[PDB]
Amino acid sequence: ASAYQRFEPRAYLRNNYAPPRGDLCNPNGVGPWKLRCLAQTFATGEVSGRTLIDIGSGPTVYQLLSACSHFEDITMTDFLEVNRQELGRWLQEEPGAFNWSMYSQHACLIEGKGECWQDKERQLRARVKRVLPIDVHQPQPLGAGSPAPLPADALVSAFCLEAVSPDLASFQRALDHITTLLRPGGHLLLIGALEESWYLAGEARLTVVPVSEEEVREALVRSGYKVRDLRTYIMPAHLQTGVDDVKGVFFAWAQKV
């Protein structure tokens, strides 16, 4: 909460999206697995519409690489100004931007439509209309007079809720909050840490609520979703690096009813 005031974007990108965790060459890593989950889901053709909002974007864009060709209006979000700034640098191809090209390349590989990674990035940059503040702890996470088209046809969120909640109940409530952003029938792609209790972001040490796959499932059900898919990636030893105590990564494809 106040702890997020020390959160360092570059340290976070370093710890999670640079080697080893960010190596994409080996298909058994967390990176390729996450991209794979995202791509397979959209390749189904069942997740579609006009508008999409990414909840708790942080300083990362990989979570939208497969989504962007299915949604012409995209809203990115985060609670921190610094994350939003870091997003801006990439979206505007400004100097010092993080280099997401490995991931863009990999989404292209996985998707298998012969697309060059540059076309992929252009499209993503083209369809992201706005980068907005957000606080999942608020009943109206986006605020009141949001420039964001509501309700969204679809939601994405990776490593936010559990990462910003002290306990299960808070986790459950935050999920309720963002769900009100989602149109009935809409879709939610939720990615997150399993059985994690802390992670580091430079000088920031974040407290995390440790959640299990069944708990995530139950929270989704409790929030009014049908769970279409819930998969688990177990974190191999060589990717336990001192930056957290994550045990695994869950991917959930839920649909609002």
Ligand X SMILES: Nc1ncnc2c1ncn2[C@@H]1O[C@H](CSCC[C@H](N)C(=O)O)[C@@H](O)[C@H]1O
Q: Which residues bind a second copy (CB under 8 A)?
A: 24-25, 27, 105-106, 108-110, 112, 114-119
* Cβ at position 244, least distance to ligand ADE in Å: 4
* Type of residue at 111: E
Strand partners, 155: 53, 188
Q: Is 136 annotated as a binding residue?
A: yes
* Cβ at position 138, least distance to ligand X in Å: 8
Residue 60 binds ligand X (CB under 6 A)? yes
Q: How far apart are CA 15 and CA 20, in angstroms?
A: 9
Q: Is 56 annotated as a binding residue?
A: yes
Q: Which residues contact 37 (CB under 8 A, 6 or more apart)?
A: 191, 231, 251
* Cβ at position 95, least distance to a second copy in Å: 16
Residue 244, contacted partner among ligand X, ligand ADE, a second copy, none, CB below 5-8 A by kind:
ligand ADE
* Cβ at position 17, least distance to ligand ADE in Å: 8
Residue 24, contacted partner among ligand X, ligand ADE, a second copy, none, CB below 5-8 A by kind:
a second copy
Secondary structure of the chain in the HEC alphabet?
CCHHHCECHHHHHHHHHCCCCCCCCCCCCHHHHHHHHHHHHHHCCCCCCCEEEEECCCCCCHHHCCHHHHCCEEEEECCCHHHHHHHHHHHCCCCCCCCCHHHHHHHHHHHCCCCCHHHHHHHHHHHEEEEECCCCCCCCCCCCCCCCCCCEEEEEEECCHHHHCCCHHHHHHHHHHHHCCEEEEEEEEEEEEECCCEEEEECEEEECCCCCHHHHHHHHHHCCEEEEEEEEEECCHHHCCCCECCCEEEEEEEEEC
Which of 38, 65, 78, 132 touches ligand X by CB under 6 A?
Answer: 78
Q: Which stretch binds ligand X (CB under 6 A): 37-45, 135-143, 179-187, 219-227?
A: 135-143
Residues touching ligand X, count (CB under 6 A): 21
Span 179-218, contacts to ligand ADE by CB under 6 A: 193, 196, 199
Residue 134 binds ligand X (CB under 6 A)? yes
Binding positions for S-adenosyl-L-methionine are: 12, 17, 56-57, 62, 78, 83, 135-136, 158
Which residues are annotated binding-site positions for octopamine? 196, 244
Per CB under 6 A, residues contacting ligand ADE are: 16, 159, 163, 193, 196, 199, 244, 246
Give me the residues that bind ligand X (CB under 6 A), please: 4, 7, 16, 56-58, 60, 63, 78-80, 83, 134-137, 158-160, 163-164
